[PDB]
Design a protein around this ligand. Structure first.
Ligand SMILES: Cc1cc2nc3c(=O)[nH]c(=O)nc-3n(C[C@H](O)[C@H](O)[C@H](O)COP(=O)(O)OP(=O)(O)OC[C@H]3O[C@@H](n4c[nH+]c5c(N)ncnc54)[C@H](O)[C@@H]3O)c2cc1C
Length: 498
């Protein structure tokens, strides 16, 4: 049927767009290919933890996987599973694996909650056509309030066993002249204290994050999407995947939409049409819809920039072996709290998360997720034979990222007399994981595939709202930028177009 506005997906861009549309009185339907995560599973919890993965952990996989960095300790808990509409999807391309959330809330279900505004001078570099004053004066503050960003108590942080891992890396970094910063989060740190005191059910302190948090984490279903539903003008249909988009003869857009069950069985294919169409299917999903539409002739006036400009936000993972006198602890909160800020907008820039590990026993390992400045980009290109977007990225394109991460951590190793671990990512000696991404950015870049507000070039009333807009890098964990940019864009679109 017809609905005035459709939003594809229910991640950050989608959730912002739907809230503001509803508040503007536009009846809006959100279509989400994953589940609404609200039914208790066979253990009484909605989500599985990292030490007890089951089918809920994985989008249509036949075996669970260990969280990257953790295979040496967590492969022992892996099991064969039925393919199922689980919450975390590892999307494998020829030389890159991209991890994305699947469900109402998107990646907000599975992410580490780190809520960070980019450095203004870097924002100005990457998006020179955007007025940065509005962003820092209005839209970034609006996003941090709406998202429920909060800050860890410093006294508790300093005292608790659950953050010893972070304090160890702070001390080691300090010996190399590097400081750390507290990273704000959407996980409720007051709740986390009470977890440690035994007062409330544990989630972050019970090795949960990457397959969902049963408590504490204010994912988008609790913040923007709850508010959007509260407008009385928004509905969400789950297990509905948009497959094609065309521009109707009489105006507007029509979608082919597959309804599946949680085993993946096709139940129905529906046509749904609208006046205004907003894509919030993520860097991967929005870009795939648009290259498909261009290259199958259903949106033939899309430009050549659709598909281009993808990058993994410079993501590299590495680890250091601590001295025996610097144990990182058996008890590590699953929510990071500290990063190493060595980002100066130069090519040696690194913003590194001090990442917890879920082993649950002492391993002496310090794990890091580095965000770097690597100019290399990939392109999604339509494969008509399999009807999929393929990401043309090669592992050598991450060499500048590896090089930047290694130069920073080599300074830390030199100052402390420590070495890398080489065995955390496979049998081959490899200290740097360079073929994954948690933070995909680009494919429908703002100002190149779209105007400066996400209006898709060549079309009216067709909008992209999500990480596909970002030109491959923001220098920090991206969801606050996605959210703020979506606030800016939908406000303008409603004022001028709706
Ligand atoms: C393990 C992990 C850790 C991360 N840690 C952080 C962190 O602490 N801080 C940070 O800032 N970022 C973090 N990220 C990245 C962050 O979650 C991500 O940048 C955003 O979620 C992207 O938001 P979008 O709105 O672009 O997109 P996203 O949240 O991926 O939402 C897209 C939604 O669209 C749905 N969808 C896709 N295709 C279709 C279709 N054709 N039809 C229907 N529905 C569809 C999809 O299932 C999903 O719910 C992390 C991500 C992962 C996977």
């Amino acid at each position: 049927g017809y609905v005035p506005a459709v939003v594809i997906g229910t991640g950050y861009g989608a959730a912002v767009s739907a809230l503001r549309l509803g508040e503007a009185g536009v009846q809006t339907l959100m279509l989400e290919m994953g589940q609404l995560w609200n039914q208790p599973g066979p253990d009484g919890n909605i989500f599985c933890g990292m030490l007890n993965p089951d089918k809920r952990s994985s989008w249509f996989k036949n075996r669970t996987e260990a969280p990257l960095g953790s295979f040496l300790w967590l492969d022992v808990v892996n099991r064969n599973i039925d393919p199922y509409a689980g919450v975390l999807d590892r999307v494998n391309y020829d030389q890159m694996s991209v991890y994305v959330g699947r469900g109402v809330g998107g990646g907000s279900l599975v992410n580490g909650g780190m809520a960070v505004e980019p450095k203004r001078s870097y924002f100005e570099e990457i998006l020179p056509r955007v007025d940065s004053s509005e962003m820092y004066d209005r839209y970034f503050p609006r996003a941090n309030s709406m998202l429920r960003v909060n800050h860890i108590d410093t006294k508790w942080f300093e005292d608790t066993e659950w953050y010893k891992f972070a304090r160890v890396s702070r001390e080691q970094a300090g010996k190399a002249g590097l400081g750390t910063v507290f990273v704000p989060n959407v996980y409720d740190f007051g709740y986390m204290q009470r977890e440690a005191a035994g007062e409330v059910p544990k989630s972050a302190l019970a090795t949960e994050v990457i397959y969902g948090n049963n408590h504490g984490k204010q994912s988008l279903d609790k913040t923007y999407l709850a508010a959007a539903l509260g407008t009385g003008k928004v509905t969400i249909q789950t297990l509905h995947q948009v497959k094609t988009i065309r521009q109707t003869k009489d105006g507007g857009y029509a979608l082919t939409v597959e309804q599946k069950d949680t085993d993946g069985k096709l139940l129905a294919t529906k046509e749904i049409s609208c006046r205004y169409l907003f894509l919030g299917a993520g860097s991967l999903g929005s870009t795939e819809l648009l290259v498909r539409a261009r290259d199958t002739g259903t949106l033939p006036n899309l430009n050549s920039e659709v598909g281009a400009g993808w990058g993994p936000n410079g993501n590299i993972m590495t680890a250091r072996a601590n001295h025996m006198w610097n144990p990182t602890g058996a008890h590590q909160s699953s929510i990071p709290a500290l990063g190493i800020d060595a980002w100066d907008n130069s090519d040696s820039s690194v913003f590194a998360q001090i990442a917890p590990m879920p082993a649950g026993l002492e391993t002496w390992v310090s794990l890091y997720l580095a965000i770097t400045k690597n100019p290399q980009r990939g392109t999604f290109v339509y494969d008509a034979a399999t009807d999929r977007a393929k990401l043309n990225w090669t592992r050598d394109q991450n060499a500048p990222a590896v090089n930047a991460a290694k130069a920073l951590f080599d300074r830390i190793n030199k100052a402390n007399g420590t070495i890398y671990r080489y065995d955390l990512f496979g049998t081959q000696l490899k200290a740097f994981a360079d073929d994954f991404c948690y933070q995909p950015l680009g494919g429908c870049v703002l100002g190149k595939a779209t105007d400066d507000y996400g209006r898709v070039a060549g079309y009216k009333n067709l909008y992209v709202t999500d990480g596909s807009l970002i030109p491959g890098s923001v220098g920090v964990n991206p969801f606050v930028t996605i959210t703020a940019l979506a606030e800016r864009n939908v406000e303008r679109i409603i004022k001028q177009d709706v």
